Design a protein around this ligand. Structure first.
Ligand code: G6E
Ligand code: G6E
Ligand code: G6E
Length: 127
């Protein structure tokens, strides 16, 4: 229905705004573009980055905030797995990756209405 389509459009508008606020943050520049380094493709089976997230929003791939946060969590978990060493370069990326994840979750906790996320879930489960 039109009411359901309007609901998913509001979700996309919200997700674009959150992703924009993450992508303009200087700490998260490393996560804004797809991966220069030839061993990434063999360590990371599903690359994810904020530009790819924006593309998925516009392709209507996220019907719930949980769908979106799964890809934020993938950005973070990929970074922790590809950068596990004690070296300062690894530790810096791990710190930024957890900050990206924590920032996304915090924006959603403070700004997304629980009843709006619940409606999205109940429409998606009906399909
Ligand atoms: C989802 C909703 O807010 C809604 N609202 C209505 N009434 C209204 O006056 C419009 C302006 N909300 S009808 C309707 C509705 C639409 N598609 C499926 C189901 N289950 C309900
Ligand atoms: C597309 C993307 O990944 C993106 N990257 C940015 N990078 C930066 O600002 C620098 C600091 N890395 S800003 C930004 C962006 C995201 N959503 C909406 C708009 N208008 C821009
Ligand atoms: C996508 C990602 O996690 C990523 N990791 C890097 N790690 C490093 O450059 C070394 C220093 N840990 S660079 C980079 C881009």
């Amino acid at each position: 229905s039109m009411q359901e389509e309007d609901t998913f459009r509001e979700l996309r508008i919200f997700l674009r705004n959150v992703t924009h606020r993450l992508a303009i943050d200087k700490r998260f520049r490393v996560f804004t573009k797809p991966v220069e380094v030839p061993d990434y493709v063999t360590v990371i089976k599903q690359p994810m980055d904020l530009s790819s997230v924006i593309s998925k929003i516009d392709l209507h791939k996220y019907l719930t905030v949980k769908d979106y946060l799964r890809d934020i969590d993938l950005i973070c978990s990929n970074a922790l797995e590809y950068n596990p060493d004690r070296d300062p370069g690894d530790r810096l990326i791990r710190h930024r990756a957890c900050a990206l994840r924590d920032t996304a979750y915090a924006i959603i906790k403070e700004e997304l209405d629980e009843d709006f996320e619940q409606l999205c879930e109940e429409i998606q489960e009906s399909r």
